[PDB]
Design a protein around this ligand. Structure first.
Ligand SMILES: Cc1cc(-c2nnn[nH]2)ccc1-c1cc(=O)c(O)c(C(=O)O)[nH]1
Ligand SMILES: [Mn+2]
Ligand SMILES: [Mn+2]
Length: 174
């Protein structure tokens, strides 16, 4: 599968390995669920990029669950902020709030609603592969250059997938 090779070529081994671990520990073969694999990589990367543009952020995503909950818990006890129900993606020490990051192949408002419906003090920031984003109260957290870098990376993933005729498949599997 070119999709599997593409992921190998375009994300760095840590992201790939982290994504593989996540899949394989819950019994999902990344060689069969190749679109899932690519999405998990994409989303991890966005999450890592977003933290890197700060340390302003605590990365919650990509840790094993024990660690993620340890981190979340340690944040709740030292700040007073409510413990989210699910693991969010980041903690913002400047705005003192968790962030859930969304990456979508569909309309950003659509994905934003799904996340907001699923979530309750958590800040939501959705990115698309089109350069669109949407964020709680139109507060985008990052500065424009960091956001522009995320969107550039995401648009380049799309185009790479499209160079390899994987984009149509990838787009319809969200
Ligand atoms: C990246 C991803 C892909 C899939 C998926 N399932 N099938 N294809 N992609 C499901 C959930 C997630 C996902 C998205 C998130 O934004 C997110 O914060 C998480 C998470 O589990 O914390 N998972
Ligand atoms: Mn997450
Ligand atoms: Mn997320």
């Amino acid at each position: 599968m070119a999709m599997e090779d593409f992921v190998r070529q375009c994300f760095n081994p840590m992201i790939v390995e982290l994504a593989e671990k996540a899949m394989k520990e819950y019994g999902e073969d990344p060689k069969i669920e190749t679109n899932k694999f690519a999405a998990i990589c994409t989303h991890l990367e966005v999450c890592f990029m977003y933290s890197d543009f700060g340390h302003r952020f605590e990365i919650i995503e990509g840790r094993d669950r024990i660690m993620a909950w340890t981190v979340v818990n340690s944040i709740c006890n030292t700040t007073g902020v409510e413990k989210p129900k699910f693991l969010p993606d980041l903690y913002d020490y400047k705005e003192n709030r968790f962030i859930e990051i969304g990456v979508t192949r569909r309309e950003v408002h659509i994905y934003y609603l799904e996340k907001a419906n699923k979530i309750e003090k958590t800040h939501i920031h959705i990115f698309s592969f089109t350069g669109e984003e949407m964020a709680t109260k139109a507060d985008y957290t990052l500065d424009e250059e960091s956001r522009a870098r995320i969107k550039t990376r995401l648009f380049t993933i799309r185009q790479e997938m499209a160079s390899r005729s994987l984009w149509d498949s990838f787009r319809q599997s969200e």
